[PDB]
Design an enzyme around this catalytic site. Structure first.
Site, PDB file in Angstrom:
ATOM      1  CD  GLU A 190     -29.138  11.347 -53.351  1.00 11.79           C
ATOM      2  OE1 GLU A 190     -30.084  11.888 -52.736  1.00 11.79           O
ATOM      3  OE2 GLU A 190     -28.484  10.384 -52.892  1.00 11.79           O
ATOM      4  CB  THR A 243     -25.703   7.653 -63.109  1.00 11.11           C
ATOM      5  OG1 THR A 243     -25.561   7.789 -61.688  1.00 11.11           O
ATOM      6  CG2 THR A 243     -25.715   6.182 -63.478  1.00 11.11           C
ATOM      7  NE  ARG A 258     -23.784   9.249 -51.701  1.00 14.01           N
ATOM      8  CZ  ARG A 258     -23.423   9.789 -50.541  1.00 14.01           C
ATOM      9  NH1 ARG A 258     -24.259  10.561 -49.858  1.00 14.01           N
ATOM     10  NH2 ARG A 258     -22.205   9.568 -50.073  1.00 14.01           N
ATOM     11  CG  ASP A 296     -22.542  16.102 -63.734  1.00 11.72           C
ATOM     12  OD1 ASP A 296     -23.608  16.592 -63.306  1.00 11.72           O
ATOM     13  OD2 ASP A 296     -21.990  15.099 -63.227  1.00 11.72           O
ATOM     14  CD  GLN A 345     -24.398  19.848 -52.188  1.00 11.96           C
ATOM     15  OE1 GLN A 345     -24.315  20.320 -51.057  1.00 11.96           O
ATOM     16  NE2 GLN A 345     -23.616  18.866 -52.606  1.00 11.96           N
TER      17      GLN A 345
END
Ligand SMILES: Nc1nc2c(ncn2[C@@H]2O[C@H](COP(=O)(O)OP(=O)(O)OP(O)(O)=S)[C@@H](O)[C@H]2O)c(=O)[nH]1
Ligand SMILES: [Mg+2]
EC number: 3.6.5.-
Length: 313
Positions: free
Chosen positions: A12, A17, A147, A169, A173
């Site tokens: 995150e 984005t 998200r 990209d 995690q």
């Protein structure tokens, strides 16, 4: 003429984005069909957000401001299923609306550093009336705010300043980081993202390790990786808009006990920048191009990326 940009960073941090921004900036943005595709994600993010606060209220023992919210909360689960299918009845919207305005709910929302909550929770919840209207079609900002954890390698292409960009990209995690090494070939530049707002948070994967400290370990690893000696390292100290809001009411000393500056955006920001840049073990031979960003803000990203491109050449 081809340039391979590899987006790295913890969970995150805002990597995807930034990818969406390239679409908005270098193309013509998301079409109606693509925006509609995001409608199910907006609604699941929205339900996900309100359910997260309601869940938290149970663990932290926060009561509803009005007892009446209890059946609104139960009606929420009865109707939630509709949301992820991409549907939002006036009844469900009404239920979320009433829940979001409750003081007990709001009290819990403000304690969001004590649990996991979507960064865009307030953004969607505050715009309930708009997103719930019949025939709602997500706006570019709505798409930017969605998200969805990234798994696998997403590749995107665009032309800018006569260069053919090939942006990669990956996910941040645990399970996904193990797979970053698959993208280490031919990278022209790495844009390592960091959520500045993470300084007072524990990981979604663990709660005794500060998220920013984890971000620092990953950056220390990448930045100093000799495999990456001739690769431009760009650092995006992201979510500066949320950091600005947090620094006023949350001490940076939680993350950095040695911090002596004040709780001001400029001072704290510079401090974190120095914390990360200090990890560079070859300061005279390797340059880290740092930029403060708000990934969801197109104008910011547009000027920042134009700058980064000039650095890439
Ligand atoms: N307010 C605000 N929200 C941001 C900013 N950057 C990203 N976000 C929001 O943060 C959430 C996570 O962003 P995302 O781009 O998915 O992160 P990621 O690094 O790609 O995460 P992953 O794919 O490793 S799990 C999304 O809802 C996005 O809209 C920012 O600068 N400001
Ligand atoms: Mg992602």
């Amino acid at each position: 003429r081809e340039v391979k940009l590899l987006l790295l960073g913890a969970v995150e941090s805002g990597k995807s984005t930034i990818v969406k921004q390239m679409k908005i900036i270098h193309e013509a943005g998301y079409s109606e069909e693509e925006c509609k595709q995001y409608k199910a994600v907006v609604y699941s993010n929205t339900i996900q957000s309100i359910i997260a606060i309601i869940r938290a209220m149970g663990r932290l023992k926060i009561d509803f401001g009005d007892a009446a919210r209890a059946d609104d909360a139960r009606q929420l689960f009865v109707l939630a299923g509709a949301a992820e299918e991409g549907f939002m009845t006036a009844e469900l919207a009404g239920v979320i609306k009433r829940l979001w305005k409750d003081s007990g709910v709001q009290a819990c929302f403000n304690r969001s550093r004590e649990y996991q909550l979507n960064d865009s929770a307030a953004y969607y919840l505050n715009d309930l009336d708009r997103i719930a209207q019949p025939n709602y079609i997500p706006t570019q900002q709505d798409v930017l705010r969605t998200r969805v954890k990234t798994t696998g390698i997403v590749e995107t292409h665009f032309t800018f300043k006569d260069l053919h960009f090939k942006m990669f990209d990956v996910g941040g995690q645990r399970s996904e980081r193990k797979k970053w090494i698959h993208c280490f070939e031919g990278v022209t530049a790495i844009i390592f993202c960091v959520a500045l707002s993470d300084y007072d948070l524990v990981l979604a994967e663990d709660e005794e390790m500060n998220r920013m400290h984890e971000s620092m370990k990953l950056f220390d690893s990448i930045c100093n990786n000799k495999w990456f000696t001739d690769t431009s390292i760009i650092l995006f100290l992201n979510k500066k808009d949320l950091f600005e809001e947090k620094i006023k009411k949350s001490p940076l000393t939680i993350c950095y006990p040695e911090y002596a500056g004040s709780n001001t955006y400029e001072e704290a920001a510079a401090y974190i920048q120095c914390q990360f840049e200090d990890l560079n073990k070859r300061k005279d031979t390797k340059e880290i191009y740092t930029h403060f960003t708000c990934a969801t803000d197109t104008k910011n990203v547009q000027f920042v990326f134009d700058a980064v491109t000039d650095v890439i050449i």
